Amino acid sequence: MKKVMFVSKRNSSRSQMAEGFAKTLGAGKIAVTSSGLESSRVHPTAIAMMEEVGIDISGQTSDPIENFNADDYDVVISLCGCGVNLPPEWVTQEIFEDWQLEDPDGQSLEVFRTVRGQVKERVENLIAKIS
């Protein structure tokens, strides 16, 4: 199985936003996963904006980058335009990419939906190559 890991500064925001889309675009094909620099709570505005597209994140994992290990997850995506700042062991997997995203915590709901449109676009492109 080619398992996936989404990596952000907030696991709660972009990694969870990509996790929920990669789950609803890839369930039973491969396993999706989300990690990040801050193992923060299920984000209150993301639980809203993701339920609008059928994606409840309120029960979803928010694991820290130092508890996870990339050895089981051969597809590791960065969600910040910053992926070279991650630990090199979490970079040297067969697929490593960055989606160039902005943190939606405390932005307007139009921007919070805009980064949802961006993760949808880039999740499809990622998960559909291993489907």
Q: Which residues are CB-contacts of 54 (< 8 A; sequence separation ≥ 6)? A: 24
Q: How far is it, in rounded angstroms, from Cα 129 to Cα 36?
A: 23
Within 10 angstroms of residue 65's Cβ, the number of other Cβ atoms is 21
The CATH class for the domain spanning 1-131 reads: alpha beta
- The domain spans of the chain are 1-131
Burial (CB < 10 A; 0-12, 13-18, 19+), residue 20, is buried
Coil, strand or helix at 106 = coil
